[PDB]
Amino acid sequence: AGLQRTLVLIKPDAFERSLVAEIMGRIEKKNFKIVSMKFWSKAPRNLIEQHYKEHSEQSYFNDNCDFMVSGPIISIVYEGTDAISKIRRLQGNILTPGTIRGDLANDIRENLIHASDSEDSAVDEISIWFPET
Template sequence: MPTPDLLDPRKEHTLVLIKPDGFRRGLTGEILRRIEQKGYVLKGLKIKKAPLALLEEHYEEHIERHYFPALAEYMMEGPLVAIVAEGDRVIEGLRIMAGATNPTLANPGTIRGDLGRDWGPDAVQNVVHTSDSPTSAIREISLWFPELAYDESGESAL
């Protein structure tokens, strides 16, 4: 379990989720290797099953969309890996490393381009989620790692 003193307040932090398809297919090590090889530091790591209430909070902007039930079902189909990564411009860097949301359109060399699958409109398995902004990262980390509880300045609230 991470502790707040492990987070460097001078660095940026982001949430990465290795989705159930990635965990089930044994891709966790490969994804972690890519994150660390890029120079980012793992500051939190846990394997868990995502309850619907957590997914509703995490994907709050999508909850009214037609695809949310399928997304929630996909995210609850098995364990996933939640990660807090730290580094300079880590949010932007991991978004680039992840690639386009649709694995078919993601460039080769990206996580989704190399490892994701697109099996129709209800079966896109894009392997990872990454925070899309500093504000989202803070909110998402507080949901998945409440023990870290830090504010928008990046300072620990604990």
């Protein structure tokens, strides 16, 4: 059908601020289903760097990796109609109220959640976190 899969990361600030269920709940409410899920008490920097490889040239690259390994993260593969972009809109940004980041986050770095932004990004990110493909 229009069925898709996408990769979401719940970031360490979410655990810090006790917002894990709140975030997963918003995705659950829009009728997306968990296909795979993995809890990392601390992610290997290796995985983080791969995941953010497209960002390796940026000023914020290392500070961001630092944060991403500063506490637990959950990686989830979601599935549903048009999953990649719909879950991207749910994530939104810190400027737009009504989205996850819009309602709950206020920082350029500590922003609670990652979602794949394209078909190619999803395929690649899912592979990084669930290599057992």
